[PDB]
Amino acid sequence: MEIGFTFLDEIVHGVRWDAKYATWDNFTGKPVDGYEVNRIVGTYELAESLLKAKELAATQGYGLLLWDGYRPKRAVNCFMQWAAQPENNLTKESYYPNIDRTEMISKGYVASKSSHSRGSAIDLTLYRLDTGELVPMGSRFDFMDERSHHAANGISCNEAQNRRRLRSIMENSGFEAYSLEWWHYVLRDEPYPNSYFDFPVK
Ligand SMILES: [Zn+2]
């Protein structure tokens, strides 16, 4: 494991995760290059502040489900290569109806360069601690639609409020949200801005 980085579960202990890109259940339909392990890797400072976020989901009995933390530059290239491929319609319905692969970059949904490669960005939801069920957010992880925006309409009052609660837990825990994706959060004062790493999630 690279220096300054860690598997986030080794710091944030009861945390739920599903490394979507080490899995076939992502918009490319296969595991993404650079993700060799079904784990969420991150900067220690990301882990530290995620731990505060995990604890602050005391703001109700909310638990965190992590989907993606540190993302290798080669993972970002793999997404770009995928966006340049012909449409096989394999993941279009679930991940990007209403736009196409091309537009998924034009519209700020897939980054040429990603904050994730700096090791301090995280993708996550909340689940109910009591009930153990996923907190409904109106759109799926990597949904790639205006529906996924924090400010989006066509999302119920609960779903919009739920996104607001995730956002508030994150903002109160040293993170900055991102308008276009309710799941994306970057550590506010991150150890390595301007550094985009490429060691594998391994
Ligand atoms: Zn993200």
UniProtKB/Swiss-Prot annotation:
The keyword Protease applies. Optimum pH is 7-9. Inhibited by aminoalkyl phosphinate analogs. It catalyses: D-alanyl-D-alanine + H2O = 2 D-alanine. Its EC number is 3.4.13.22. Catalyzes hydrolysis of the D-alanyl-D-alanine dipeptide. This is D-alanyl-D-alanine dipeptidase.
